[PDB]
C-alpha cells in the first residue's frame, strides 16, 4: 500500500493519505549507485496546506508542488524544514520562488549555511532547548535534542495522532546506522525517549526514509544507534 522506490520513477513524487487532512510525500534520488526513498508531510491548514520538508532537491520539489496541485488543489503557503540536510532544505529555492514561506529553526538555518545548502527564509523561535515545543498552525514542532543531527525537529499532528519523526527515526527494515556524520550518537537515545514521553498517544510514526509504522520505530532506532555506538 505505501509506495517503495520501485513504484516511483526518477523525478516523480507520490502522495499517501495517512489520515484526514494528513499526507506523506515520497520521492527518490540515486546516491553511490543505490536508490533511496525520502518522506515529508503535508497537513491541511483550513483551506491552505503546510508542507514539512522538501522532496529532496529542486526537480523533485517542483514535481511535489505539481502533484499537490493535481491531487489536493489547495495552496502550499508555508514549509518547515526539520533539519539542514538536502533531503529537507534541497528545493527551498523552488518553494520560495513559488511564493511559499520557508521556515526552519535558527540552528537549522546556520548549519544549512555552513554546508552551503539552501536556507529557509524564516527563523522559528522557541525550539533551542531539548524538550521545547511550539504550535505552528495545525502541527506541534518539537526539538527532542540532538540525534541524527544537532538541529533535528519532529512534527506532531494532534488532530490525526500522526508523528513525523524525520531522520531521527529509522524505518524497521533499516538495520545499520548509514549517514551519522552530523549525529550526536551519545544523545540520540535520550532524544528518542523525549519523543516517546511527549507523544505516547501517537498512532502513526513516519520516518525520514522508508515505511511508516507505530511507536515501535522509536525503540527500533535506539537499538540500531546503540549497536552502532558499540561498533
Ligand atoms: C538515507 C539518507 O539519505 C540522505 C540524503 C540522508 S541525510 N538526511 O542524512 O542527508 C539519509 C538519512 O539517513 O537520513
Ligand atoms: C546525496 C546523498 O544521498 C544519500 C542517500 C546520502 S547519505 N546521507 O545516505 O550518505 C547522501 C549524502 O549527501 O551523503
Ligand atoms: Mg492538528
Ligand atoms: Mg530509515
Ligand atoms: Zn539528515
Ligand atoms: Zn516571509
Ligand atoms: Zn534523511
Numbering used by the authors: 32 to 262
What does the report in the manuscript say about this coordinate set?
Production of metallo-β-lactamases (MBLs), which hydrolyze carbapenems, is a cause of carbapenem resistance in Enterobacteriaceae. The genes encoding MBLs, including IMP, NDM, and VIM types, have become widely prevalent via bacterium-specific transferable genetic apparatuses such as plasmids. We report here that sulfamoyl heteroarylcarboxylic acids (SHCs) can competitively inhibit the globally spreading and clinically relevant MBLs (i.e., IMP-, NDM-, and VIM-type MBLs) at nanomolar to micromolar orders of magnitude. X-ray crystallographic analyses revealed the inhibition mode of SHCs against MBLs; the sulfamoyl group of SHCs coordinated to two zinc ions, and the carboxylate group coordinated to one zinc ion and bound to positively charged amino acids Lys224/Arg228 conserved in MBLs.
The modes of interaction between SFC and NDM-1/VIM-2 were also determined. The omit maps corresponding to SFC molecules were clearly visible in both complexes, although the second SFC molecule, which is slightly farther away from the first SFC molecule binding to Zn, was observed in VIM-2 structures. The key aspects for binding through the sulfamoyl and carboxylate groups in NDM-1–SFC and VIM-2–SFC structures were quite similar to those determined for the IMP-1–SFC structure. The sulfamoyl group coordinates to Zn1 and Zn2, the carboxylate oxygen O1 coordinates to Zn2, and the other carboxylate oxygen O2 binds to Asn233 and Lys224 (NDM-1)/Arg228 (VIM-2). Of note, there was no corresponding stabilization caused by Trp64 in the L3 loop of IMP-1, which holds SFC in the active site, in both NDM-1–SFC and VIM-2–SFC structures. Such structural differences in the L3 loop may cause differences in SFC affinity; the Ki values determined for inhibition of NDM-1 and VIM-2 by SFC were 9.82 μM and 2.81 μM, respectively, which are >10-fold higher than that of IMP-1 (0.22 μM). Although the inhibitory activities of SFC differed with individual MBLs, SFC bound to MBLs via their common architectures, through Zn1, Zn2, and Asn233, and through positively charged basic residue Lys224 or Arg228 of the L10 loop.
